[PDB]
Subunit: 461 residues, 4 copies
């Protein structure tokens, strides 16, 4: 009689369970932690509020946390990213989860609140796992008394880490955090190669458009922009890259991309005259990857080639000025998470109008909105780090420290390099790769231990 | 002017033509000339320089001179000098001692010719080094000269490692800037430079088709990453070896099979430990580690007949060439290309099929069998070198009181803002256009519109 | 639209509005096909044509169907594969008043029944006079079961490699009854559809079926013809380590030069049928096998027994017998993951352990995986193939082979390709759809290389 | 000993050439397989072959295979810049008449061909021709018709030479049958495409040492050479645009991930400067011609090119670029052999620091052979195995000895049968260590082939 959940359709549970069993075989680092730590129960007594895309991969993460002793209450961090069979399988396992694909904004907020509250009162939470910072923000704004008893936050993604560091700067952050994003087996695995796999995946599922031979503009060339650019170039697109960071732009050039700006001489002064109309009128596909605001703005949207595809793979939908499009242009749903936006006006459209744009996932994270996000074998690395981060902060017991000791420990930190390497080793073994062992003479020659770590903390890979 | 030694001074006109072309390929370096020529920030500097005497190094040398410095120059490798570059620098009245094909003894003599002027120590006050050999000679043999020198600027990963070992041991005598770990150096030079120049050198040395053949790249740091791409883009089937599991993970994700020369990765010294089946299929082995003996005697014995063996790390001990000198007969095909006959030591059959082809006698193959990195890539590294020389020279460490020197003795990198400024000049050289953040956008992501755009922890 | 229309059978007519939305998008992706619509609509070159059509009932086929109709034809349609229909495409065609009998997930019995529903109208042979086929199944049924209908048919236009081979066999055996156009061997079909189509849709289908990471894993592609070339690229561009098998040494040479290792599932390439001839060390390392040959049993029972645990097995050739799925049905337990995705448990036939690790993943039950687990080739690629189909239909229909005297018929009973000039005109429209700009030869240049300024630009021997 | 019937740059380079020939033999298994297969049979005994093709190390292995099979030869190069002087020396030192050096003048080029045609001032008793580009074939038809009476055939290497043969056949002026070696798949789709993939960026790097990644290239043409050339540049990270007159080839460029553009506005070349897309050409760092056509990089294109762009040709003849215009109007500064800065500031003199120049490679001649070493041995293995088989077939047919009625039936331009194409391919695949699968009898029956091949109909395009 378990009822402490809300999912789209509980009858999808058997299907979700079949896919979880497959996913376990694709996630050796995460399942290795399950086997290594099961007897010890290092998360016994942990009570984790989790907010991250309710995918099959998150399902394996949740059940690893539970297998190590934790109790959890879970929600998704995006209205379109849940896989309903994954949510059903978790709910059918007796785990509180409030998540479905296609939530409204009000439902999204309600779902987070259902994890925070149990039977109408604050849950006895003591750990937080977040992706993007929404749950973290609600706790700080609305439930400060709950944070007094929370030992830490483990944050998944670049945007969430920025929000933690802003709180730390302002002296408003109430509990320490681990920046999971900046493990190399997260940032340079998930952010880059994950988007390489799943960006062209989502575009094909949403539009079935041929990509070879067409023109793309990727806004940004950080980890996500690098992987996105490769996702499209490997399909044969002619990819141009925009950047504000001259070092990242230099990498784009050296990687064989043309670096362009939507604005003449790169000056974004807000005028239509500043738009490089010739450039934008050639673009078949624009992808935003920045974690910034309004990097595909109204004047760019007005100048884009007819029938171009517009999508966002950064964490939040405000990378694209969709608000402008809702206010001025008529939306025609093609199918879920695929809309034609008719630039002919707001009040109705011609069904055969040629002047439209195709927007994917209403500008929300397109890989998760129009496909299934990153594949299991990539999320293996991110979620192995999440588990280790939860163990570390839970064992530190920040909430139980004296005030003076809390002040010495209130920080945003990364996991040590040795853990990062041990996660990587399990990933490599999953490919059947064979890592060479240094001889004593060789380890002495380059000044490392035979077991590692093999690089200084300054190394960038 | 007679204060130099080069292979042929009459090549000067040719080198000058190539320097004029190279200048048009090095916008960051030439931008430093234009912007600091008035200030003359290096007026009074006397720089000892030891780096591959290429055309690219000539543009660096003349940039330092254009900003006020005097220099005395040598190459940091016996095979890396471009004889027309050295001639052009000598013909410009700049002391330089470098030619392609030096002996080990001639290599040491050349460094000593920069250190000494008229049989006496030159009054040097700055050091520019690539690999640490000049730094090592100064500390061991001429330690008193180091009392006048304001700083060292080291170019490459191996040399930085040596600098840090000296700092840890309390034997570093002057402050130094790690030029290697600017992003516009490391992640431009070390990776992209080897992508351009590794397949270049293999083609010039052998003219072998690479497509469809099997390569083993030992290492997957920046040089191994660029080397692997240089071969894969030609259509090689590339396997990668690594001791670092993170770098190995990147190799897998980049589409490479990760293998070890040793069964289960365990290098226990025996022939039995060699994966003879793997090595018997490899047509090309490339070492990229900066480590010792990563292509060892037992691997060389197991290699497929007629395989190519080469090294693009800094030092020639990555391959056990000493074993091959002891046991096998060397047949020179042409300069820097040797057939190594595994049939025996004394003599060989001209038609023997059981040989390996060794490039550049195991020395840096890109500089040994071709011309190293291209000008537009070296532009990034060398603009950092100029900035680092200005920075250390203006701090005047050698003139500080004893107490102030103790706090000033360190190995530092350049600030990120300068790194970004070099990158911007490189991007403009491609005709790239960088976008400027709006004030609201800069506030949104927590940066200045000017930059730096990333925290110092960012890995790119 | 027509009142009381019931002459169809589809999965779900309510998908029609969704199908129509996608047809309108596809029209913008198919400029060669839509150019033929605009150029020929007024002439009505197919007025009076009654076309039996048998090809994958996708959105792309929908645009083809409505082009033929816009040029004057009546059609009756079925799919040429049990898994390749897009149900919203079939619904939109049926909702337009066009007889169509197709849905995703037909049984073999239903598949045959659907073709017969096109052949029959109101219980009697339709007065068909044209045939459009993909793989030869409809061609075969007409010759075998309804030979008298072939007396009124002017031509067959066959789409794919396997179907052309069947036509050539019939021609050499004297059993072909009507002339045909080999649409496959236009360059804008073969070297666009067969190669680039599979490049787009093979990794698409594997991702939709399994969501497996492909980068860093080991693939074996059996075959390196046009489909094998495109399939190998689909996987290599994702970062797979791809090995290629071939029986044709020229195709094997191309695979080597393209950067692939060429290997055989059998030691020294010799299949003596025994398990001892299997290269078990090779097969035990393969994460994904893809068959591309158009041949029989190229992924056989002994290979399936030797494959690495949890490897994915799929077929992108026309027929499922490339893989010995019959052996797997006889001996191993099938666990459906989701539609067109099965785990095949090598532990035995009767039961399976839900947590057994010794299984293979079979996609689309061995049927064309790009159409079975995704949506096949994209519209802009199918534009080339289907423009050729329209031109071929117009040519044969205007030829009126069925109305000729017996003597004249023997003279024209042939399998032909379209002339190179038309191939070039299709290609030009495709290039314009990318915004490409073709240069025009000067008179002096055209004289220098011996061509007309308007083309054709290559001799018929040219291979591109 | 006593051998003087040659002319090379420096005979003392022979030992060096020989060392490279021994290496190249291990890279050329199909050609060396033909040596072992036919050495005892001596199928070329009595053949006397006039040869005109790039005197490279790879051509050295071809020559010695023909000699090992019984033939005598007299050789020249088919390009003034393509000879490797150590290869020519090794051949001369083996007692084989060769007349070739890198850096010939036009007068020396013609003299070298004439030295092969004449021996002791009189027509050699030639009975076979091996040609690359058709220059030797043209001289024989125009100047030595009596020699063609006794010649059994021509085996022609390259696309341009084949077109010239077909023109002669059309006009009824071809005097002896030919084999089109170019259109074996192990030639055209190996040499023309993959060879240029290897050797184009090679020659550009040796000539300029320019970084290619991140820069803009324009490839004129997308046939076999243009496809290989575009890949040579793209795989280095260039942003490559492609021009074409053939819409099918342009379709392939699009689908291959290239932007297809024209140097002319709307692709209409009307001869005016107004027709030039100045904005497009002003952004191009490197232009490569691949067409076999005339004037596809014309004067107005050269005037509009971005300052300091590299200009080169990898088609067979230098007239793909209007170099004559540049010699008439602009000052040439030699950087080093086969690399010239062309100063667009005027014809008389230049400023050493002028920024407005172009870099021309190999004076517009075949850039891969002029600035590097052409295609690698393991690729040329395929082309030259086909050459040996073509020589054997036409020499054994003995066209010159046939009655007039029988000659009329055999006067044609043909390709080798596909079975032989496949046999060359298999030796190439074995050289990579590849393992071809053998069809079962049922599989061969199912697809309608013999187990041993041929595996494809003659219409198949690969
Ligand atoms: N969808 C996914 O699966 C996924 C995965 C990881 C991260 N993300 C999200 O994607 C975003 C980017 O993450 P990241 O790790 O790549 O961060 P990052 O800091 O490495 O890269 C962002 C880049 O955008 C550039 N940029 C910022 N404003 C710009 C502008 N106006 N124009 C052009 N370039 C601009 C920055 O210079 C920077 O290089 C974040 O919101 C992150 O949370 C999404
Ligand atoms: N030739 C050039 O132009 C050039 C340019 C830059 C640097 N270098 C030199 O190349 C070398 C590598 O430089 P880098 O920047 O790549 O350093 P790096 O630290 O980034 O890479 C070296 C890699 O080798 C790996 N490695 C070490 N021992 C190994 C072993 N036994 N087997 C397999 N892998 C092993 C390490 O794990 C590491 O990832 C240094 O000597 C550097 O000075 C050469
Ligand atoms: N799914 C699709 O979208 C699609 C598209 C076009 C064609 N096809 C089908 O794909 C198949 C292949 O078409 P194609 O145009 O590439 O034909 P093709 O003749 O060009 O190539 C088939 C290749 O398979 C090779 N082969 C045959 N038997 C083999 C064996 N035992 N082992 C290894 N290789 C073997 C042949 O040598 C040949 O090169 C046909 O059935 C065709 O109808 C499918
Ligand atoms: N350098 C080498 O090693 C090498 C090797 C093989 C062939 N070649 C030579 O290269 C040339 C091309 O050979 P191929 O086999 O690629 O021939 P091809 O017929 O396959 O290709 C030439 C292409 O040029 C295109 N073209 C013609 N005029 C054009 C124009 N004005 N603008 C743009 N494109 C135009 C044609 O449409 C055609 O596709 C010939 O001269 C051939 O002999 C050189
Ligand atoms: N599959 C996935 N599951 C959870 N978080 C993700 N972020 C990106 N892809 C994801
Ligand atoms: N989308 C598609 N429609 C019809 N036939 C196809 N063959 C391959 N892909 C196809
Ligand atoms: K997924
Ligand atoms: K260089
Ligand atoms: K489709
Ligand atoms: K060569």
């Amino acid at each position: 009689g378990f009822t402490d959940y809300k999912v789209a359709d509980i009858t999808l549970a058997a299907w979700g369970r079949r896919e979880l069993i497959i996913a376990e075989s694709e996630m050796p680092a995460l399942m290795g932690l399950r086997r290594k730590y099961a007897g010890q129960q290092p998360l016994k007594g942990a009570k984790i509020l989790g907010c991250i895309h309710m995918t099959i991969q998150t399902g394996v993460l949740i059940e690893t946390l539970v297998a190590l002793g934790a109790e959890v209450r879970w929600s998704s961090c995006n209205i379109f990213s849940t896989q309903d069979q994954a949510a059903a399988a978790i709910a059918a396992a007796g785990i509180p989860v409030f998540a479905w694909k296609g939530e409204t904004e009000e439902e999204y907020e309600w779902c987070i609140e259902q994890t925070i509250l149990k039977d109408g009162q604050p849950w006895d939470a003591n750990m937080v796992l977040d992706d993007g910072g929404d749950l973290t923000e609600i706790l700080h704004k609305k439930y400060p008394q709950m944070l007094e008893r929370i030992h830490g936050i483990t944050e998944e993604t670049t945007t969430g880490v920025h929000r933690l560091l802003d709180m730390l700067k302002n002296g408003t952050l109430k509990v320490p955090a681990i920046n999971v994003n900046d493990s190399v087996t997260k940032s340079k695995n998930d952010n880059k190669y994950g988007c390489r796999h799943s960006l062209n995946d989502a575009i094909k599922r949403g539009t079935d458009h041929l990509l070879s031979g067409k023109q793309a503009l990727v806004i940004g060339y950080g980890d996500v922009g690098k992987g996105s650019s490769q996702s499209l170039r490997q399909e044969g697109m002619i990819v141009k890259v925009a950047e504000v960071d001259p070092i990242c732009a230099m990498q784009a050039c050296m990687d064989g991309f043309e670096v362009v700006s939507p604005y003449k001489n790169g000056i974004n002064d807000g005028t239509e005259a500043s738009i490089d109309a010739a450039l934008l009128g050639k673009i078949d596909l624009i992808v935003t990857t920045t974690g910034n605001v309004n990097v595909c703005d109204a004047n760019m949207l007005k100048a884009l080639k007819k029938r171009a595809v517009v999508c966002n793979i950064g964490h939040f939908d405000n990378e694209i000025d969709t608000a402008f499009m809702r206010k001025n242009w008529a939306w025609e749903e093609v199918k879920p998470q695929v809309h034609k936006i008719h630039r002919t006006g707001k009040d109705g459209f011609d069904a055969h109008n040629d002047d439209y744009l195709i927007l994917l996932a209403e500008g929300r994270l397109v890989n998760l909105g129009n496909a299934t996000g990153h594949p299991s074998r990539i999320m293996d690395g991110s979620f192995a780090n999440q588990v280790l981060a939860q163990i570390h902060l839970f064992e530190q017991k920040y909430a139980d420290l004296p005030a003076a000791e809390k002040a010495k420990r209130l920080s945003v930190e990364v996991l040590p390099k040795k853990l990062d390497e041990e996660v990587a080793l399990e990933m490599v073994k999953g490919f059947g790769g064979v890592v060479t062992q240094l001889t004593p003479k060789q380890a002495e020659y380059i000044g490392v231990s035979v077991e590692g770590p093999f690089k200084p903390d300054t190394y960038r890979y």
